[PDB]
Amino acid sequence: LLGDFFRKSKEKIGKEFKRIVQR
């Protein structure tokens, strides 16, 4: 179930990409 794989990365990226692409 890859979907789980992304959930782990998406969460890591989400927080990281959230602070890098700050508008």
UniProtKB/Swiss-Prot annotation:
Coiled coil: none annotated. This is Antibacterial peptide LL-23. The gene is CAMP. It comes from Homo sapiens. Transmembrane segments: none annotated. Poorly active (MIC > 150 uM) against E.coli strain K12. Is able to induce the pro-inflammatory cytokine TNF/TNFA or the chemokine CCL2/MCP1. The lineage of its organism: Eukaryota, Metazoa, Chordata, Craniata, Vertebrata. Changing S9A: Slightly increased MIC against E.coli K12 (MIC=15 compared to MIC=5). Changing K18H: Reduced antimicrobial activity against M.luteus.
